[PDB]
Design an enzyme around this catalytic site. Structure first.
Site, PDB file in Angstrom:
ATOM      1  N   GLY A 149      31.663  54.513  53.553  1.00  0.00           N
ATOM      2  CA  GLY A 149      31.590  53.082  53.905  1.00  0.00           C
ATOM      3  C   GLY A 149      32.900  52.518  54.434  1.00  0.00           C
ATOM      4  O   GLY A 149      33.848  53.295  54.667  1.00  0.00           O
ATOM      5  N   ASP A 207      38.493  38.096  40.502  1.00  0.00           N
ATOM      6  CA  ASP A 207      37.390  38.402  41.443  1.00  0.00           C
ATOM      7  C   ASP A 207      36.392  39.330  40.792  1.00  0.00           C
ATOM      8  O   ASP A 207      35.931  40.266  41.408  1.00  0.00           O
ATOM      9  CB  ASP A 207      37.871  39.023  42.747  1.00  0.00           C
ATOM     10  CG  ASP A 207      36.846  38.871  43.875  1.00  0.00           C
ATOM     11  OD1 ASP A 207      35.902  38.093  43.733  1.00  0.00           O
ATOM     12  OD2 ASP A 207      37.035  39.551  44.901  1.00  0.00           O
TER      13      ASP A 207
END
Length: 347
Positions: free
Chosen positions: A22, A139
């Site tokens: 990816g 996050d």
């Protein structure tokens, strides 16, 4: 130079049999065979040296991940880079291969109550350590929770991580924020820069709700819609909780909203373990002062099968001081990345 999707992916002699897996934040991610450990590993190519911002995030993530040593935080196994600053255009970070992440898992798989409990335990055990190092993740979300085939969980992606600064956390209404909207604590939209540990507990609360139903609990479409989603379930904040928001634009905004009653956790999550919902309620508390601390969450009845504080280690070496990276030029940040990566060099 070995090539992948013909770009350079030049990983020593030690890493062979490359497979594209990816495109991450600062470049391309592949798997590769590690010839010295006889295991397949993950390798992230980073090319950040053109941009002061990319150097900042790269340095911050490498400093943090090399200082941390914890079963539930992704470690750096190796760092491949040129032997000189001049030849260093790319950095390759080698880490344990993790077959999946909680985002990918939740898209297709129902979790048993035992999986939810064990995954939550691991998240909190890793977060205890992060917080004990005086660091805020900032996050946390499913895609930043890596999993292998035996359900070992590792927190990753310290790109937004900061040294905790509760004394300098106050800010104006509608202050811009980078971290994923759906896991942002109500106070980020109101009066907080997200420099207090309670912001991470909120995100973990959102992740627990997402594990109970396979859907995000608060999928806001815009900054103020995130607040409407939160107050749609928690209800209008109490007078006491509002009195804690001294900022007039933020207080008067909340006062402008029609009254909403709480939606009971057991209506949203009829299949859920009552103990999971008790702990969820405590994590998704509007007032960050009343919000449960990481160590209290580990001690909650829901996690009593796993809870072992002697086996929930804290950091030997906290970050006591702010990382003053914002005003360092590209060139200094590249030297500091070079220095930070120097222990992985032959010699």
């Amino acid at each position: 130079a070995a090539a992948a999707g013909p770009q350079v992916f030049d990983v020593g002699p030690r890493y062979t049999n490359l497979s594209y897996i990816g495109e991450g934040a600062y470049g391309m991610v592949c798997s590769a065979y590690d010839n010295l450990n006889k295991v397949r590993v993950a390798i992230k190519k980073i090319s950040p040296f053109e941009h002061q911002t990319y150097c900042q995030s790269t340095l911050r993530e490498i400093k943090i991940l090399l200082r941390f040593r914890h079963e539930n935080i992704i470690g750096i196994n190796d760092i491949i880079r040129a032997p000189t600053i001049e030849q260093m255009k790319d950095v390759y970070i080698v880490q344990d291969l993790m077959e999946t992440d909680l985002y990918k898992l939740l898209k297709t798989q129902h979790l048993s109550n035992d999986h939810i409990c064990y995954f939550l335990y691991q998240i909190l055990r890793g977060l205890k350590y992060i917080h004990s190092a005086n660091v805020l993740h900032r996050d946390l979300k499913p895609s930043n929770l890596l999993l292998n085939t035996t359900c070992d969980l590792k927190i990753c992606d310290f790109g937004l991580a900061r040294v905790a600064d509760p004394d300098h956390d106050h800010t104006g209404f509608l202050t811009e924020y980078v971290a994923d909207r759906w896991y942002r604590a109500p106070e980020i939209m109101l009066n907080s820069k997200g420099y207090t540990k309670s912001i991470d507990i909120w995100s973990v609360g959102c992740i627990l709700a997402e594990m109970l139903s396979n859907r995000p609990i608060f999928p806001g479409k815009h900054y103020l819609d995130q607040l409407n989603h939160i107050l749609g379930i928690l209800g209008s904040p109490s007078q006491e909780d509002l009195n804690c928001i001294i900022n007039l634009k933020a207080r008067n905004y909340l006062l402008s909203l029609p009254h909403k009653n709480k939606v009971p956790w057991n209506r949203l999550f009829p299949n859920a373990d009552s103990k999971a919902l008790d702990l969820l309620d405590k994590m998704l508390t509007f007032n960050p002062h009343k919000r449960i601390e990481v160590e209290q969450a580990l001690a909650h009845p829901y996690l009593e099968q796993y809870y072992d504080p002697s086996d929930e280690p804290i950091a030997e070496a906290p970050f006591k001081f702010d990382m003053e990276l914002d005003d360092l030029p590209k060139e200094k940040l590249k030297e500091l990345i070079f220095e930070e990566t120097a222990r992985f060099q032959p010699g």
